[PDB]
Amino acid sequence: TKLTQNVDLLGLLNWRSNSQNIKHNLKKLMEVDGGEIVKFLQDTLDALFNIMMEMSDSETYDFLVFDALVFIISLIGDIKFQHFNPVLETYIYKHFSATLAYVKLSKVLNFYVANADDSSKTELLFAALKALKYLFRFIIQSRVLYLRFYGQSKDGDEFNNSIRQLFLAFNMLMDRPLEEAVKIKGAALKYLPSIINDVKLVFDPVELSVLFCKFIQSIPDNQLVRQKLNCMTKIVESTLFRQSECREVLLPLLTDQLSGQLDDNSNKPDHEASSQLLSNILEVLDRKDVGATAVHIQLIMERLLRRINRTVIGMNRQSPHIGSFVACMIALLQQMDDSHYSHYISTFKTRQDIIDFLMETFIMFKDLIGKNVYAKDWMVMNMTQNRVFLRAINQFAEVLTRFFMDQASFELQLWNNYFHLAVAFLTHESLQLETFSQAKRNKIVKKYGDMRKEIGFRIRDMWYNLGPHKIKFIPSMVGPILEVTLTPEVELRKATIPIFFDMMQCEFNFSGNGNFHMFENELITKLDQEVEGGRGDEQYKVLLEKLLLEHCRKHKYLSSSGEVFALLVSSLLENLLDYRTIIMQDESKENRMSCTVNVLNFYKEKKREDIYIRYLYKLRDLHRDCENYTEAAY
Amino acid sequence: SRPILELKEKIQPEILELIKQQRLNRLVEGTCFRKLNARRRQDKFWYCRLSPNHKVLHYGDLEESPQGEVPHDSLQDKLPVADIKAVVTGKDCPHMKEKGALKQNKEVLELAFSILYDSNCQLNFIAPDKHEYCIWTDGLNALLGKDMMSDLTRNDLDTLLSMEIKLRLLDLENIQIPDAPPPIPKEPSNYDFVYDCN
Amino acid sequence: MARWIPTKRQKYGVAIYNYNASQDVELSLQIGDTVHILEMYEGWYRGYTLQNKSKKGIFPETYIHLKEATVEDLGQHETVIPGELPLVQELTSTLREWAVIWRKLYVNNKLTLFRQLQQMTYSLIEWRSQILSGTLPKDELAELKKKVTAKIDHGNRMLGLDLVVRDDNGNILDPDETSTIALFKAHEVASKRIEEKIQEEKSILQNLDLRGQSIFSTIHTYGLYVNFKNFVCNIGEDAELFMALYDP
């Protein structure tokens, strides 16, 4: 690891006494074995740096030192030499000795960029591009070495300008067509943020940011889309820990690219790339130390949400990373405040556009809760999704109450999507789901409480806020509310049977012209199907009857009618109770027909003709299981 | 481990209980049993299900069912336990004493079990192998409410006892149980609870 | 039986034996009854048992091997080594649910998975025992954290159970609702390990070369251990035996 077998390495280390050979040594350094190279990497670097200082005026030697150094760093980037890459940065921070290598190398690479179309500088600029991070670690370090060696940089303007004309070389090179230097543009985009943190040492963050902004608006806006996505992503990676001074200058341009990505029908390379964008930006903006951005978070909302929601109108397909995009904007929801939401979520354009937006968002939510986008193993992510969707829909609830409620003269029928969406979401993760493990109840309640509880009480206060238009909404929501009452939860159900009394009272006001007969009919129907399903229980019907009966006591004669109808309901219920218990107890024939003829008779009593027929069908099914052509005929 | 073994083997009740329960479930589920000398196109497969009521045996001259039990009131759906004297097992079986055409061979001695009911007609049965034979007679003894005579049953009982005592002893790790239980501290003879109950 | 006090410095209620029936709410108490004692008496302790977290039991302090430890062993630094003993409590609750798993695993004749469950169970109880203390290096601590999480969620995968993330340091930090996307890709990590295992049971428990290849993709330098036993050769003189690796 110390012995060297090459004339070239000894000559280049001894270039000072081999000064006639410096030009030839700078090219013979290529054939030196890397294994021998990292034996004296420090000395080779010092040799080259003292070269391009001692005849920095001879820019031929500076160019060859540039080329040789670039080739060495490319070689060291190898996995064999990735261990001496720490040794290389050790040299960068410690063993470097070139007081003007910042000027010289920024100069040479400004030449490389301004002369990139050259196919002899093309490879040279490329190999400089791959290690731009390393090279301007070296160069920013040479800049500060100049600072120290001269107290103040009388080159204080010179080098930062060399950077600025290198910005302009960027802009002019890439203003040219993409054909000559598509890969050069890609490498610029890639390794350009690799050096922005290098230059953060010695340049103004804002001037640097806007110099890049000029470069990026020298973009003809149809070239290497995910590549510039990478570029900005590595940019916000670094350089954003100082957020409040570039965040507000880049997010303009970056929401420009976003709204271009809103729907350009060319997102098919940029879908996952933009989701990644969202990811890292939500990180860094949500990174607490990186910088306060709450108002800029609201800027993001106002300039990116109708955008991305029409974009997920675009990406509404389940097969792609739709789930990852879901994660994106719901992370946004998490990282964000209702101070930001109701600011302009509640204050979009004309009420028609905003309600179209909420149509979009609500149908999307209902389509995600249905055909859920997890593996069922993501109860953790399930809960996360629950909370964030809760947040979003809560915001839309305030915008509904304050802009489309009794507030609005009409269009109280987003509430259909609201309520049914909320219920359909609510119809998973129940007490038995909590009952999987013994700690499972405890695990959820400690880590999450009972999300269902908040969901239900939210919807309940919404219902009470509806007021008159319960009647204008009851038959739509009769089905879902019975189910939510079904939920094995004691408290939401206890709060929900009074909601049954609420809408039967409303249709009691409607009973001046009609009655709750449609309400109770739909209620009975859905009751039939649901108790057939088998969620509820005995104490459950007890709670149902106690509540509704009592509430109707709190009310008039027609509430007494509704009382005896709820009595019929409870009769029905217990009939289904013992019915099903026999259905899943005896599993003989005769008892099944026993209970089914009983309940059939009960429909006959209630004339529930349709369902009466339905269980007549079940019963005849039993009889031709028994080939009771006799009974089946009857 | 002597106090530990005292503590362990003293709290038996539920282990043999659950093993016998499992045996009962085995009889209730049942399978296709074997008749006697099922040679001249005779059903070596036919089921004997212990009732869901655990009161009738669904044994009947059913066909060669490779799946196993077919659920119906079998050709002999009834076998009440109030009259089941015992089951003859091994050479004690009348079908093992047959010297006529139904002479059971020497490969069915462990497949020998005939339920004693009515004192004259024995459910002269043949098993497919030893273990389920021992399990059948185990579950039948469970209907009789007596010991289980499968070697594997005692295997299960001992291993469950060992695992259970293993899965209790965790907290007294780093502590010892004196063979004489540690002295019960003299409780305050007054039942007085200065702070309220619970 | 006076002087009862509500306190939380007792959570590890510890028995001695199949306890006496000294009180109406006491029995031949289970050995691993960490009882949450709601009432503090000098010689006795009554509170929520481990079997019943809703019922008291007056247990003698001569039998109570009281431990001030709460659920987390770092609040009073009950950790034998910081950032670990959450592992011991999670493993205890783990075996709690293992109880239900295996007690069902006999009901269904699935004895192969049930026996590999038993042998993983013996491995985990012994690893649990060695990490009762912090004797192993923190390298072994993190390694066994990884392995315990691996086997736990492996049982979960085999049984469609919950997913615990934050692979290291107690599997809580990420499931501590820190973010969304970090949590998102962490649950993605969870599914990645899901696929790793669910595809690798047949690769390691069954196959023997792919496991070696996967290991060797991570390690580059190797040493061929050669143990010369005895040399048989008819030389009649001093023999120099030059042993080296060869590539024909």
Closest CA to A62 of A101, A33, A7: A101
Do the Cβ atoms of B195 and C65 come within 8 Å? Answer: no
Helical packing angle, A59-76 and A101-114, nearest 10°: 90
Distances (CA, A) of B34 to A192, B39, B44, B122: 82, 11, 4, 14
Whole-number Å distance between alpha carbons of C160 and A144: 59
* Mutation target among A78, A283, A384 for the C interface, most CBs of C within 10 A: A384
* Mutation target among C96, C156, C158, C184 for the A interface, most CBs of A within 10 A: C184
CA distance C180 to chain B (A): 38
| Contact between residue A53 and residue A98 where contact means Cβ atoms under 8 Å apart | yes
Subunits with 3+ Cβ pairs within 8 Å of C are: A, B
Distances (CA, A) of B132 to B93, B112, B139, B140, C104: 17, 12, 10, 12, 20
Judging contacts by C-beta atoms under 8 Å, the chain C residues touching residue B188 are: 1-2
Whole-number Å distance between alpha carbons of A450 and B72: 47
Query: Of C16, C28, C106, which is closest to B11 when you measure between CB atoms?
Result: C28
Whole-number Å distance between alpha carbons of C2 and B196: 10
Q: Which residue has the tokens 């539920």?
A: B14
Q: Which residue has the tokens 């490498």?
A: A187
Kindly state the tokens that stand for A139.
């160069």
Helical packing angle, A379-403 and C181-200, nearest 10°: 150
The angle at the Cα of A212, spanning A207 to A213, to the nearest 5 degrees, equals 90
Closest CA to A544 of A467, A469, A482, A629: A482
| Contact between residue C166 and residue C145 where contact means Cβ atoms under 8 Å apart | no
C190 near A CB under 8 A = yes
**Using CB atoms within 10 A of its CB, is residue A446 exposed (0-12), middle (13-18) or buried (19+)?**
exposed
| Contact between residue A76 and residue A41 where contact means Cβ atoms under 8 Å apart | yes
Resolution of the experimental model, in Å, one decimal:
4.5
Do the Cβ atoms of C12 and B10 come within 8 Å? Answer: no
Kindly state the tokens that stand for A211.
């110099």
| Contact between residue C161 and residue C155 where contact means Cβ atoms under 8 Å apart | yes
Which helix (H) or strand (E) covers residue B59, if one does?
strand B57-59
CB contact burial A451-469 (16+ within 10 A = b; e otherwise): bbebbbebbbebbeebeee
Do the Cβ atoms of C162 and A381 come within 8 Å? Answer: no
Do the Cβ atoms of C190 and A377 come within 8 Å? Answer: yes
| Contact between residue B27 and residue B12 where contact means Cβ atoms under 8 Å apart | no
Whole-number Å distance between alpha carbons of B84 and B82: 6
CA distance C220 to chain A (A): 11
Which helix (H) or strand (E) covers residue A333, if one does?
helix A322-334
| Contact between residue C237 and residue C229 where contact means Cβ atoms under 8 Å apart | no
Kindly state the tokens that stand for B76.
């002999």
Amino acid at A161: N
Query: Of C14, C17, C38, which is closest to B7 when you measure between CB atoms?
Result: C17
Whole-number Å distance between alpha carbons of A10 and C190: 54
- Number of Cβ within a 10 Å radius of residue C60: 23
* Mutation target among A381, A382, A442, A445 for the C interface, most CBs of C within 10 A: A381
Whole-number Å distance between alpha carbons of A286 and A293: 8
Q: Which residue has the tokens 């389920």?
A: B132
Do the Cβ atoms of B193 and C30 come within 8 Å? Answer: no
Do the Cβ atoms of B173 and C132 come within 8 Å? Answer: yes
| Contact between residue A101 and residue A56 where contact means Cβ atoms under 8 Å apart | no
User: Which spans in B30-129 are helix H?
Assistant: none
Q: Which residues contact C173 (CB under 8 A, 6 or more apart)?
A: C166
Whole-number Å distance between alpha carbons of A482 and A573: 13
Amino acid at C90: E
| Contact between residue A191 and residue A130 where contact means Cβ atoms under 8 Å apart | yes
B57 has which bridge partners?
Answer: B50
Do the Cβ atoms of A377 and C163 come within 8 Å? Answer: yes
Eight-class DSSP state of A429:
S
Which helix (H) or strand (E) covers residue A524, if one does?
helix A517-533
Query: Of A328, A375, A440, which is closest to C191 when you measure between CB atoms?
Result: A375
CA distance B63 to chain C (A): 25
Do the Cβ atoms of B181 and C16 come within 8 Å? Answer: yes
* Mutation target among C17, C29, C37 for the B interface, most CBs of B within 10 A: C17
- Number of Cβ within a 10 Å radius of residue A144: 14
Query: Which experimental method was this entry solved with?
Result: cryo-EM
Do the Cβ atoms of C96 and A438 come within 8 Å? Answer: yes
B184 near C CB under 8 A = yes
Judging contacts by C-beta atoms under 8 Å, the chain A residues touching residue C34 are: none
Distances (CA, A) of A466 to A392, A406, A420, A499, A605: 20, 8, 15, 12, 36
Query: Of B22, B168, B193, which is closest to C1 when you measure between CB atoms?
Result: B193
Amino acid at B26: R
Whole-number Å distance between alpha carbons of A42 and A421: 66
Q: Does residue B33 sit in helix, strand or coil?
A: strand
CB contact burial B41-70 (16+ within 10 A = b; e otherwise): eebebbbbbbbeeeebbbbbebeeeeeebe
DSSP letters, A55-91, are TSSSHHHHHHHHHHHHHHHHHHTSTTTTTTHHHHHHI
Q: Which residues contact C46 (CB under 8 A, 6 or more apart)?
A: C4, C23, C25, C37, C38, C39, C56, C57, C58, C59
Distances (CA, A) of C53 to A10, A540, A594: 79, 26, 44
Give the residue on B whose Cα is nearest the Cα of C4.
B195
- Number of Cβ within a 10 Å radius of residue B155: 11
CA distance C157 to chain A (A): 9
Give the residue on A whose Cα is nearest the Cα of C101.
A437
Is the four-CA dihedral B32, B37, B39, B42 of positive or negative sign? negative
Q: Which residues contact B180 (CB under 8 A, 6 or more apart)?
A: none
Judging contacts by C-beta atoms under 8 Å, the chain C residues touching residue B166 are: 125
Judging contacts by C-beta atoms under 8 Å, the chain C residues touching residue A328 are: 181
Kindly state the tokens that stand for A29.
């350094």
Subunits with 3+ Cβ pairs within 8 Å of A are: C
How is chain B split into domains, by residue range? Answer: 1-29+147-198, 30-146
| Contact between residue C59 and residue C71 where contact means Cβ atoms under 8 Å apart | no
| Contact between residue A370 and residue A421 where contact means Cβ atoms under 8 Å apart | no
Q: Which residues 80-139 on chain C approach chain A with CB closer than 8 angstroms?
A: 93, 96-97, 100
DSSP letters, chain C, are -------SS--B----SS----STT--S--TT---EEEEE-SSEEEEE-SS-TTS---EETTT---B---SSTTSS---SSTTTTHHHHHHHHHHHHHHHHHHHHTTTT-HHHHHHHHHHHHHHHHHHHHTTSS-S-HHHHHHHHHHHHHHHHHHHHHHT------TTGGGTSGGGT--SHHHHHHHHHHHHHHHHHHHHIIIIII-SHHHHHHHHTT-----------------SS-----------
